[model samples]
Target: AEGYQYRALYDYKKEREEDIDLHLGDILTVNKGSLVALGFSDGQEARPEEIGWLNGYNETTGERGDFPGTYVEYIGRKKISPP
Candidate 1:
């Protein structure tokens, strides 16, 4: 299974665009079609997973929004051992 994980490099709050506010070291999961509104792509073609903004959903606050893709980095994989 693809266990890709990402972490935010800095804190980002919605200022102009409807985006997911991120705190420093915030972890995020992105779906295949999840992307920023207009900051990254113009909806012309599929953007690379790490190249464009993504719909960031926070399990902590139960909120979701378009977060800056450049503000995050691939850390590793999430461990999910079945109990």
Candidate 2:
């Protein structure tokens, strides 16, 4: 099985346009109704899983609560590209 991914970048001021860099490994499209997963890493020695969820965005209104530039991953096939 394979999966696709995308990297989102946002300005600290939240006044500029946000960036969404979809990785070569991404298998999904930048559209609504697409299922994806997000995870947060524990920046420590333990390196435990912080949190994850099966999430998607509201295409009508690009809003992710207090956080922006969210990263996503999912299961499926993808054309691997240079990391």
Candidate 3:
């Protein structure tokens, strides 16, 4: 599938937005419409095999929360780096 991947720049936790906790080097996949909202949804990692909504805001809290987009750096697309 064609999708954007990113690496976490720092640790993060879901506050009031739709996001997941991130470690300094955690890799995450950007969900559709993520950029439009200035955040992300459904960040996926292979080690954990888990997916969750990630946000760019630090003050949003809920089942789907927000985290700072700055916490993660874009790693490009699937075509650019195949598995």
In candidate 3, position 63 carries an lDDT of: 26
C-alpha lDDT of candidate 1 relative to the true structure: 0.59
Best by TM-score: 1
Better of 1 and 2 by TM-score: 1
| TM-score, model 3 to reference | 0.50
C-alpha positional error of residue 2 in candidate 2 after TM-score superposition, expressed in Å: 1.5
lDDT of 3 by residue, 1-83 (tens): 34456666788765543456766776555444554364333543321223333432221221233545556666665533456
Give the lowest summed-lDDT range of ten residues in model 1. Answer: 40-49
Q: Model 2 over residues 1-83: C-alpha lDDT tens digits?
A: 22223333222233333422233333222222232222232321111112222232322244432212233323323443467
Q: Rate the local accuracy (lDDT) of all candidates.
A: 0.59, 0.29, 0.48
Point out where model 2 deviates above 4 Å: 11-83
Pairing residues by index, what is the TM-score of model 1?
A: 0.58
TM-score of each: 0.58, 0.18, 0.50
Better of 1 and 3 by lDDT: 1
RMSD of each: 6.3, 12.3, 10.4
Model 2 vs. true fold: TM:
0.18
Q: Kindly report which residue pairs in candidate 2 clash with one another.
A: 2-76, 4-25, 4-26, 4-27, 5-26
